[PDB]
Design an enzyme around this catalytic site. Structure first.
Site, mmCIF file in Angstrom:
data_model
loop_
_atom_site.group_PDB
_atom_site.id
_atom_site.type_symbol
_atom_site.label_atom_id
_atom_site.label_comp_id
_atom_site.label_asym_id
_atom_site.label_seq_id
_atom_site.Cartn_x
_atom_site.Cartn_y
_atom_site.Cartn_z
ATOM 1 N N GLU A 124 51.655 42.734 45.288
ATOM 2 C CA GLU A 124 50.664 43.177 44.584
ATOM 3 C C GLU A 124 51.439 44.958 44.315
ATOM 4 O O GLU A 124 51.652 45.302 42.789
ATOM 5 C CB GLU A 124 49.424 43.674 44.992
ATOM 6 C CG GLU A 124 48.540 43.791 43.919
ATOM 7 C CD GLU A 124 48.118 43.542 43.107
ATOM 8 O OE1 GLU A 124 48.060 42.533 42.678
ATOM 9 O OE2 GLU A 124 48.334 43.547 41.730
ATOM 10 N N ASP B 230 46.885 46.248 35.653
ATOM 11 C CA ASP B 230 47.053 45.192 35.458
ATOM 12 C C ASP B 230 47.955 44.210 34.383
ATOM 13 O O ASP B 230 47.838 44.263 33.526
ATOM 14 C CB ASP B 230 45.804 44.532 36.503
ATOM 15 C CG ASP B 230 45.277 44.026 35.889
ATOM 16 O OD1 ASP B 230 44.391 44.833 34.395
ATOM 17 O OD2 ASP B 230 43.815 43.607 36.208
#
EC number: 3.2.1.17
Lengths: 281, 141
Positions: A72, A81
């Site tokens: 991540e 994101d």
């Protein structure tokens, strides 16, 4: 010299019917090849040694967190994101609102500081550990995931926690095949099924690492999640000891090569063979 | 040299982006997974590197076990060459001979040898008149 004299003996017939320029053409090529291979050698030895230097400098001062950091990623300033929403630290979503300062309001309400979206090291792990606990509490709430999470060892749990952080628990629950086999504790068939999914085709890098963690129940694919596995590259200095071979026989190797270039051109296969044997002895 | 240029390549990526900026709090870890991948390519290297030491003596032995096939075929060829020197129609190249030998395939070495004779006879018997067929049988035998 012994090779020259031997060469003329074991090949050329007749009493002094020929000259010795093989010797010279052979001394010179040797000067060429010893220099070339020696330079290239030292170049390599310098490179692993300054490389080793940056590694000795790379040790300075001195777990699921390193896992979630790896696929991540860890951010100490606010960013967006894949879907463009507002996030900070590890996958911690402040707001899905397009508003720029809606995230700053939520974060400051979360961490309890006035920050513009720039956070300290420890707070990154605090928000992470918090996000994890919350995700774990939710799994136990979910009646499809709960038995599994109870079944699994800590390591494989950490893997399930990982799938939850990506896809959301609702997403992890649709896996019923893979999850069933995971609680049944047959890890290969589970991994083979996990391999088949839109989850894999989308991110078959992370999905591959999670899967082999489910398999092995080991952290290796991904307790070695400590940067100390970089310390292990330290033991790959063995090259330094391999040189001691390569270079010790460098001279010998170049002699064969020099002689092979020079004397052998006009000789039969069998001739080069036996001549090479003489040369090696 | 491919695998050692692949290692040097990631070994380069390591050095390059280890010095880059300073802290490396996040990204160098996102590189470390590329050097963790480097560790797997380094295992590929040791795998090939280890099966080299196994290759050389197995190879060096296989040239000794097959020696005999060579030494028969140099004399069987030499015979066919000598047929060619008597009369123009009876020539042969090492080409045809090797091409014939390939057919041998498409106590193992014994079998491959016995087949050699049988296949060389079976083919080249036809390029010779009765006299030389009979010379060829008796010689090869």
């Amino acid at each position: 010299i012994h090779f020259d004299r031997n060469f003329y003996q074991k090949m050329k017939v007749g009493v002094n019917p020929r000259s010795p320029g093989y010797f010279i053409d052979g001394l010179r090529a040797l000067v060429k090849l010893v220099t070339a291979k020696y330079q290239d050698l030292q170049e390599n030895q310098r490179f692993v040694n300054v490389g080793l230097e940056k590694l000795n400098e790379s040790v300075l001062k001195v777990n699921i967190f390193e896992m979630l950091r790896i696929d991540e990623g860890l951010r100490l300033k606010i960013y967006k994101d894949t879907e463009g929403y507002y996030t900070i630290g590890i996958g911690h979503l402040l707001t899905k609102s397009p508003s720029l300062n809606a995230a700053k309001s939520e974060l400051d309400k979360a961490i309890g500081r006035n920050t513009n979206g720039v956070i300290t090291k420890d707070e990154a792990e605090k928000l992470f550990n918090q996000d994890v606990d919350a995700a774990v509490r939710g799994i136990l709430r979910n009646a499809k995931l709960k038995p599994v999470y109870d079944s699994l060892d800590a390591v494989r749990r950490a893997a399930l926690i990982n799938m939850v952080f990506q896809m959301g628990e609702t997403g992890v629950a649709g896996f019923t095949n893979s999850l069933r086999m995971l609680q049944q504790k047959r890890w290969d068939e589970a991994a083979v099924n996990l391999a088949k999914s839109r989850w894999y085709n989308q991110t078959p890098n992370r999905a591959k690492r999670v899967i082999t963690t489910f398999r092995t129940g080991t952290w290796d694919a991904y307790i070695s999640l400590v940067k100390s596995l970089t310390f292990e590259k330290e033991r790959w200095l063995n090259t330094t000891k391999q040189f001691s071979k390569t270079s010790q026989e460098l001279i010998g190797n170049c002699i064969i090569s020099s002689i092979y270039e020079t004397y052998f051109g006009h000789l039969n296969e069998r001739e080069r063979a036996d001549m090479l044997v003489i040369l090696k002895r | 040299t491919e695998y050692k240029l692949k290692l040097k390549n990631l070994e380069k990526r390591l050095l390059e982006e280890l010095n880059n900026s300073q802290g490396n709090m996040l990204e160098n870890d996102e590189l470390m997974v590329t050097l963790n991948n480097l560790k797997k390519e380094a295992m590929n290297i040791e795998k090939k590197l280890s099966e080299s030491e196994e290759f050389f003596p197995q190879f060096d032995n296989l040239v000794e076990e097959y020696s005999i096939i060579g030494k028969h075929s140099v004399k069987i060829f030499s015979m066919l060459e000598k047929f060619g020197q008597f009369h123009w129609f009876y020539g042969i190249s090492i080409g045809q001979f090797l091409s014939c030998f390939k057919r041998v395939f498409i106590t193992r070495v014994d079998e491959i040898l016995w087949l050699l004779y049988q296949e060389v006879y079976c083919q080249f018997s036809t390029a010779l008149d009765k006299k030389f067929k009979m010379i060829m049988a008796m010689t090869m035998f």
